[PDB]
Amino acid sequence: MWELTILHTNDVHSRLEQTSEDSSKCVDASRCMGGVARLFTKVQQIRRAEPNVLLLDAGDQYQGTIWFTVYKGAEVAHFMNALRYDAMALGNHEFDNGVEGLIEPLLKEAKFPILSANIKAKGPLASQISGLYLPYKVLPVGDEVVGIVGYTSKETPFLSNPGTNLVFEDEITALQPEVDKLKTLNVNKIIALGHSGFEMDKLIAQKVRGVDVVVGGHSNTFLYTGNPPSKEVPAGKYPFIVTSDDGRKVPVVQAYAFGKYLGYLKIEFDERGNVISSHGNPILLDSSIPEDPSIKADINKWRIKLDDYSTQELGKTIVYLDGSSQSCRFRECNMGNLICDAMINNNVSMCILNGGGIRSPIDERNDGTITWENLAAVLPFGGTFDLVQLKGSTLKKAFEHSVHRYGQSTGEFLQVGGIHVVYDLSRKPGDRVVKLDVLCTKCRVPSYDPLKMDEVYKVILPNFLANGGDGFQMIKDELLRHDSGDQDINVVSTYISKMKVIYPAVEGRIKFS
Amino acid sequence: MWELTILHTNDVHSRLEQTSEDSSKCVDASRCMGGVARLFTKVQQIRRAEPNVLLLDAGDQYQGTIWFTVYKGAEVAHFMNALRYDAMALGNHEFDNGVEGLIEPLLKEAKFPILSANIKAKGPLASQISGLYLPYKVLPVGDEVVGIVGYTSKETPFLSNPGTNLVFEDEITALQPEVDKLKTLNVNKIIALGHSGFEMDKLIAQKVRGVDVVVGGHSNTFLYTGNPPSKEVPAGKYPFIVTSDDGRKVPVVQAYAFGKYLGYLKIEFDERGNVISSHGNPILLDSSIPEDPSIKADINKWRIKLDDYSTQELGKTIVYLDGSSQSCRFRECNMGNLICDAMINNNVSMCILNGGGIRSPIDERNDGTITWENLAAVLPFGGTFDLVQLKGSTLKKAFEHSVHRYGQSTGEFLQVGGIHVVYDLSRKPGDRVVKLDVLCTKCRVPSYDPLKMDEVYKVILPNFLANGGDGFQMIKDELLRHDSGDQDINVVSTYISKMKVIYPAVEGRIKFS
Numbered sequence A, B: 001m002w003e004l005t006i007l008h009t010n011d012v013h014s015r016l017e018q019t020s021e022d023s024s025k026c027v028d029a030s031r032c033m034g035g036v037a038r039l040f041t042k043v044q045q046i047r048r049a050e051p052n053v054l055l056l057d058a059g060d061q062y063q064g065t066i067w068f069t070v071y072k073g074a075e076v077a078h079f080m081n082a083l084r085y086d087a088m089a090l091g092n093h094e095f096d097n098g099v100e101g102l103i104e105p106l107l108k109e110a111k112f113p114i115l116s117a118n119i120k121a122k123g124p125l126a127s128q129i130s131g132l133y134l135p136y137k138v139l140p141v142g143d144e145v146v147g148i149v150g151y152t153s154k155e156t157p158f159l160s161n162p163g164t165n166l167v168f169e170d171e172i173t174a175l176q177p178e179v180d181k182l183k184t185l186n187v188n189k190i191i192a193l194g195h196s197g198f199e200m201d202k203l204i205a206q207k208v209r210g211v212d213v214v215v216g217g218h219s220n221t222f223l224y225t226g227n228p229p230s231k232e233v234p235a236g237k238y239p240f241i242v243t244s245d246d247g248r249k250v251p252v253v254q255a256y257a258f259g260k261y262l263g264y265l266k267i268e269f270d271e272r273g274n275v276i277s278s279h280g281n282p283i284l285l286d287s288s289i290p291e292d293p294s295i296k297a298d299i300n301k302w303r304i305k306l307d308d309y310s311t312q313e314l315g316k317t318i319v320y321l322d323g324s325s326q327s328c329r330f331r332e333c334n335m336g337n338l339i340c341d342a343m344i345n346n347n348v349s350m351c352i353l354n355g356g357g358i359r360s361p362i363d364e365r366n367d368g369t370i371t372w373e374n375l376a377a378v379l380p381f382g383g384t385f386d387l388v389q390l391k392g393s394t395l396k397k398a399f400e401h402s403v404h405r406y407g408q409s410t411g412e413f414l415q416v417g418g419i420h421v422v423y424d425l426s427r428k429p430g431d432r433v434v435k436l437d438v439l440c441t442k443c444r445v446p447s448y449d450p451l452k453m454d455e456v457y458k459v460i461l462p463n464f465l466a467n468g469g470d471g472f473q474m475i476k477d478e479l480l481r482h483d484s485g486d487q488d489i490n491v492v493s494t495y496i497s498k499m500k501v502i503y504p505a506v507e508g509r510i511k512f513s
């Protein structure tokens, strides 16, 4: 009989400073949430109350806000060290700044094991990272040992910039020998901590024999048993119970994203390291839990650098800039419309944009003041808006891909400019596009004329889509001409200043049967 | 066996200086048309070829271009005197500058009879304007007399500001005693010259016993026998033959508008002043007819004052600003979209605009340069964009009115901003609106939601529509609140400068089944 409490965050994405209800910049501080300082209070509060506790992270601490743009990992290592994190799995966004952008700020400065069993190293890089990350860590909790095995998304080479001298083996295949190794090492209790998404977490739980619990991330999954405290609608109960082939009931947990919730999972274990009972719920980190003062003071010490890099007004918004996943990945969101307008205004009649790239909404309640900061949250990656030459057939395929797996918060949903697309989800994937009228360019007056397969159109789109990202291989493998455009933020920054006061709308660009 | 040639212009609307194929400012002078100087050449050319000729005008020289804004009638009297016009009927736009702004520049300076039989004067104005205009004029042509009887639109009190001491009696009723008078005065030939439109011209021809020929205007009707020389599609043959009740075939003519065509009509008359034969066609005044040099020199000697009209680009257009009647009064024209955007940007989610108020397109081929001159052609009246508070039922009625007599180049067709209307012309007038989704204002993110009858909307529209013009009595008799807005031109002038480079489009705001 042993009691362990697992506390977990996943996909925080640089929300060190407290955010709004929608994870945008904290506007109303009385009705504000999350943050590293507020989490310190709840973590500390749990730590004293429970006997054996583990604060874990399932990746994606990188990107999302100006904190990352400025410190590039210095904030993550400093504040995760401050919060005394027990362990963290490598996320796909941890490789965004190349291999050194992982080695120099985080891997060298972290006072905690950073894990990953399915990443193997070769050649020059082989000895550089050797020992900086481990496949597993056997933490001594009380008078028991707990083995944590890490894993990072198999698709990280596509999804980010991990490098050429790192190899991403299959999760379940690379995890099993490491779990079996730990079992022989008399490690009765195995947590698997990884960044591969909910569906992959569930088969890990069902397939990897010996994993007592799965703590994942990547997909921003929100799980809840009961009536949720906020706008987040749950995908299942907390914990999600997977019945392994072993005959065990393996709990699977996720904490949404942006440090809005601290995942709490209490576990009763037997003499042999088997879950007898488990229960919990992700704790909503809201104003009812005070931000720890000493830790918040350090955030303010690290804020004056961030202040200079976004302490002035660029434009004003009278509409709420809806840059939320719930809207931008399922329907035409006004933020996507704004960015597309900004793109064409920077030069072409068509713009295409992956909803996945819309990382943050912008709140108009702060009188509409749109600062450099509000916006480096919407566009945190520093890509560009590149010119392309596409065939009508090529564009029809991309729209077909746009809703190929619709309804799974995937980022391949397109936000458009100068395109009027209508979808029918009742039909089979591959024949769901019902209309695609595009804005004419040879014409003297622009009018929407249906797309012709055999005609060549000039579309402006992010570097990510030109690179063939989000599975848009047809764009990369069928384009006629690609051109290096201007920096993504500066396209929206120059447009906002030019407009002075903005007000985009859902005007029927994307429609559904 | 008498031969009379009637030469006629109608609705020139201040196109003294030659214009483009679309009556906008002359861009390419080698492919340019119309104008007072070019007309002088063709008129003089006809005059020396034919024996008995009459140069007549059926109204509307006033308003249209900056020539009228600056000289307010000095140009009309000076150049019509130069062109040696024989007679002119009063048009509805002649009263645009009140009753004094007609008498002071034109009525006192014209070296030709200005006619109108259906305008009667009362009280103070009675003796002021006594003799300045006449109901008829008996011109001596060769060794014969020709009686011309004038008429101005019955609805001029609504259509413009004709003062308060002028009374507009019915045309056919006021014309008949004057034609009967002339017949008793032994005046065998009667040509009726008036500004009431084509349909009214045809009933005048059928009904007023004794009228040998009708030469009209107001409706910009283009008539042609054969293959037309330009974009103007004809409404009938030239001359249009009306069969009068007293067994005569009465010819009816019109020469489109803007001085693009000089209407030519050949007439064989009998001993008793009866048309035996008649034939003609409106002559396309193009570069193939040279502009008379002496007269063009005078146009340039005056032009010098008009030159200080923003001879610097307020803004640039990359699209052709389609401000033509053919588009703006039948479908959603990009010019109407531009003005509506300018109105909401000015200071509300909805804008409505009468297509009639779009008096001129703007040509983007002149390096895209938009000047105060160009804008004065689109918006020549000096109205204002007023705020209104109308209920859904009231707006639904206005949209029904919009297409109540659709297809007759009437100005009550609405151009919109933040409104998405769909019409079905197959249905009965009063049941023609199938969709009317409006842009929400109480919402945080603007989205198009269907209009509710019992809800109030805050629409921005011209003062012309607010004081119930174009038969939109429902606007004037059902509004909840009206507010004095900014000047029409200055709303578009401030918007263009703010945007720097504009590019409106036909984006589906107005649609049809």
Ligand SMILES: CCCN(Cc1ccc(-c2cn(CCF)nn2)cc1)c1nc(Cl)nc2c1ncn2[C@@H]1O[C@H](COP(=O)(O)CP(=O)(O)O)[C@@H](O)[C@H]1O
Pocket (backbone or CB within 6 Å): A011, A060, A092, A093, A096, A157, A158, A159, A160, A161, A218, A219, A220, A354, A355, A356, A357, A381, A382, A383, A409, A410, A411, A412, A462, A463, A464, A465, A470
């Ligand atoms: C230049 C491109 C910048 N990046 C990052 C990035 C990509 C690839 C390399 C990279 C360099 N190289 C080497 C070139 F030689 N190979 N590869 C680097 C960085 C990106 N840009 C845009 Cl526009 N969108 C991006 C994006 N990354 C991701 N999304 C979106 O994120 C969505 C998922 O979001 P989520 O569910 O919260 C899961 P997670 O992102 O929280 O892990 C997707 O559907 C995408 O649409």
Ligand SMILES: CCCN(Cc1ccc(-c2cn(CCF)nn2)cc1)c1nc(Cl)nc2c1ncn2[C@@H]1O[C@H](COP(=O)(O)CP(=O)(O)O)[C@@H](O)[C@H]1O
Pocket (backbone or CB within 6 Å): B011, B060, B092, B093, B096, B157, B158, B159, B160, B161, B218, B219, B220, B354, B355, B356, B357, B381, B382, B383, B409, B410, B411, B412, B462, B463, B464, B465, B470
């Ligand atoms: C402040 C309003 C300015 N005006 C002029 C005007 C109206 C009325 C008074 C007037 C002052 N008052 C007194 C107020 F206390 N009563 N009445 C003066 C001037 C106007 N404004 C706008 Cl927005 N549109 C106008 C307009 N006039 C006409 N259209 C349009 O012209 C179309 C027809 O064009 P057409 O076929 O070429 C025939 P014609 O105009 O060549 O004769 C119509 O359908 C209208 O839409």
Ligand SMILES: [Zn+2]
Pocket (backbone or CB within 6 Å): A011, A013, A060, A218, A219, A220, A257
């Ligand atoms: Zn993430």
Ligand SMILES: [Zn+2]
Pocket (backbone or CB within 6 Å): A060, A091, A092, A093, A195, A217, A218, A219
């Ligand atoms: Zn991730």
Ligand SMILES: [Zn+2]
Pocket (backbone or CB within 6 Å): B011, B013, B060, B218, B219, B220, B257
């Ligand atoms: Zn006219």
Ligand SMILES: [Zn+2]
Pocket (backbone or CB within 6 Å): B060, B091, B092, B093, B195, B217, B218, B219
């Ligand atoms: Zn008229």
